[PDB]
Amino acid sequence: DDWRCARSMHEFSAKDIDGHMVNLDKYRGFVCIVTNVASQCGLTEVNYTQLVDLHARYAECGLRILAFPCNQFGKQEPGSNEEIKEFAAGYNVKFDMFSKICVNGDDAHPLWKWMKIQPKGKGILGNAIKWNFTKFLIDKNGCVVKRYGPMEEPLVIEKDLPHYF
């Protein structure tokens, strides 16, 4: 359980959606939006399109987006990784997709376990991820600086970006 001792997102790794292992220290020096995604959520469209739009506008300034598929909320990500990738490709996604994970419980990916306990990664009423499309703002040092709940559209993050750009 050495995820508990980490101080930065950059101490973790994740399998991307194609199966390649990714050392998240490649995001050192970039501002990151880390989010759990789903294909069959009522807010699937607004989140995917607004994250693609944010990426189109701010990748030039060092913004990156890490999307983690998750099937724990109403079973709204039932597909395989290749199906989820083809679905993201349909929204013209060019940011970083990862393999499907869990975000809550003892099988939760250690990075999400880590994000939930960060001083700014704790949510209103408990740390558990409440639904699809919870967003974390990660700074250039890999620290969590804000958590955004599932009803907050990505464009709500836009005004906090220039503080960390």
Secondary structure of the chain in HEC code, one letter for each residue: CHHHHCCCHHHCEEEECCCCEEEHHHHCCCEEEEEEECCCCCCHHHHHHHHHHHHHHHHHHCEEEEEEEECCCCCCCCCCHHHHHHHHHHCCCCCEEECCECCCCCCCCHHHHHHHCCCCCCCCCCCCCCCCCCEEEECCCCCEEEEECCCCCHHHCHHHHHHHC
Buried b (16+ CB within 10 A) or exposed e, 93-127: bebbbbbbbbbbeeebbbbbbbbbebeebeeeeeb
Resolution in Å, one decimal place? 2.1
Angle at CA of residue 11, ends 9 and 93, nearest 5° = 50
Residue type, 4: R
| Domain ranges, ordered by start, for the chain | 1-165
Smallest CA-to-CA distance from 12 within 105, 91, 112, 129 is with: 112
Q: Say which experimental method was used.
A: X-ray
